[PDB]
């Protein structure tokens, strides 16, 4: 057996507007909920301080089955350790991985991770677009019987980075690079129904693909080339994709924010060529590690705040390259799945959030339903 990722979230420097509310993380206890893909029996948990400039101390970390909301099944709670000890300090810019731990992890299990912090970094490493409520209490509230029913709610994740499990060679993971259309803006809070979540459900029910996990490395507002929110896709590619465990496929579905940021035709045409070059660079680097790469066509923007005629031209340039260049190992045509048959330059009205840019839950289900699962064999 060897490690295979079952859940991950892509880290960044948290912006002030997305910081934890009072009472803050220092000397407080934070309960967070994640939804895994594949199950297993022996796990490790990864925590990141990659974007913080001060050390961060976790006095204790516990894991348990979440019962919804902030509640847990207390008989399932276990403590993590880090070289035998319950407490660990992360160095500035670094991550830590727990000791391996036995836990009955079922497919699509909701896992509550409870961290009691000591001193923390005001530049926080986290993932603002969690689409999931986290719960904060002042003090050290690490007992499995602690009451969180009154905790301060925050719809962000902090510090947590991944869960991997030990599996046999038939087990593997898909890693997915994207923006908020992949991170799940428009999906239901606490409903774990981002399109990669909907893909995980389809894989788990298809007997042939039941041991294939899904690692959602979307970042809300992300760019491939420059600017945007969080580190660019090119900058984070090694950490967020190539260093994951057990990955045998990458889906690249990103670039709308690069196009959306352009002020004129000249700039938009340059971004289209830059995206194509960036796709080729990431395809090559993944291929050199034996990973197959599938390309997602960029979905419609007309009627959204991003629409301009010259931006639409760039989008079409990129999509024609995705569809026809042959450089991707296959094409996942999300544009074809999401576009209105009656007005192909706009999203299906009933499958979007009101902004004509982000799908809604139905749209994310349609997008996952358009993926041929035969792309993930062995």
Numbering used by the authors: 9 to 386
Lines quoted from the article behind this entry:
Acetyl xylan esterases (AcXE) that target mono- or doubly acetylated Xylp are well characterized; however, the previously studied AcXE from Flavobacterium johnsoniae (FjoAcXE) was the first to remove the acetyl group from 2-O-MeGlcpA-3-O-acetyl-substituted Xylp units, yet structural characteristics of these enzymes remain unspecified. All homologs were confirmed to release acetate from 2-O-MeGlcpA-3-O-acetyl-substituted xylan, and the crystal structures point to key structural elements that might serve as defining features of this unclassified carbohydrate esterase family. Enzymes comprised two domains: N-terminal CBM domain and a C-terminal SGNH domain. In FjoAcXE and all studied homologs, the sequence motif around the catalytic serine is Gly-Asn-Ser-Ile (GNSI), which differs from other SGNH hydrolases.
Three crystal structures of AcXE from Prolixibacter bellariivorans (PbeAcXE) were also solved, including a native form (1.35 Å) and two complex structures, one with MeGlcpA-Xylp (to 1.26 Å) and another with acetate (1.13 Å). The sequence identity between the CspAcXE and PbeAcXE is 52.4%. Both comprise an N-terminal CBM-like domain consisting of three antiparallel β-sheets, and a C-terminal SGNH domain where the central β-sheet comprises five parallel β-strands flanked on both sides with α-helices. In both cases, the CBM-like and catalytic SGNH domains are tightly packed and connected through a loop of six to seven amino acids. The residues forming the CBM-like domains in PbeAcXE and CspAcXE are 1–175 and 1–176, respectively, whereas residues forming the SGNH domain in PbeAcXE and CspAcXE are 180–385 and 181–386, respectively. The first seven N-terminal residues of PbeAcXE and the first 10 residues of CspAcXE did not have electron density and so were not included in the final structures. The active site of PbeAcXE and CspAcXE is located at the C-terminal end of the central β-sheet of the SGNH domain, as is common for all α/β/α hydrolases. The Ser-Asp-His catalytic triad is formed by Ser188, Asp363, and His366 in PbeAcXE, and Ser189, Asp363, and His366 in CspAcXE. In PbeAcXE, the oxyanion hole that stabilized the oxyanion intermediate during catalysis is formed by the main chain amides of Ser188 and Gly228, and the amine side group of Asn265. The substrate-binding sites in PbeAcXE and CspAcXE are mainly shaped by five conserved loops, from which two belong to the CBM domain and three to the SGNH domain. As indicated by a structural similarity search against PDB using Dali, the structures of PbeAcXE and CspAcXE are most similar to structures of GDSL hydrolases of unknown specificity and some with esterase/lipase activity, i.e., TesA from E. coli and Pseudomonas aeruginosa.
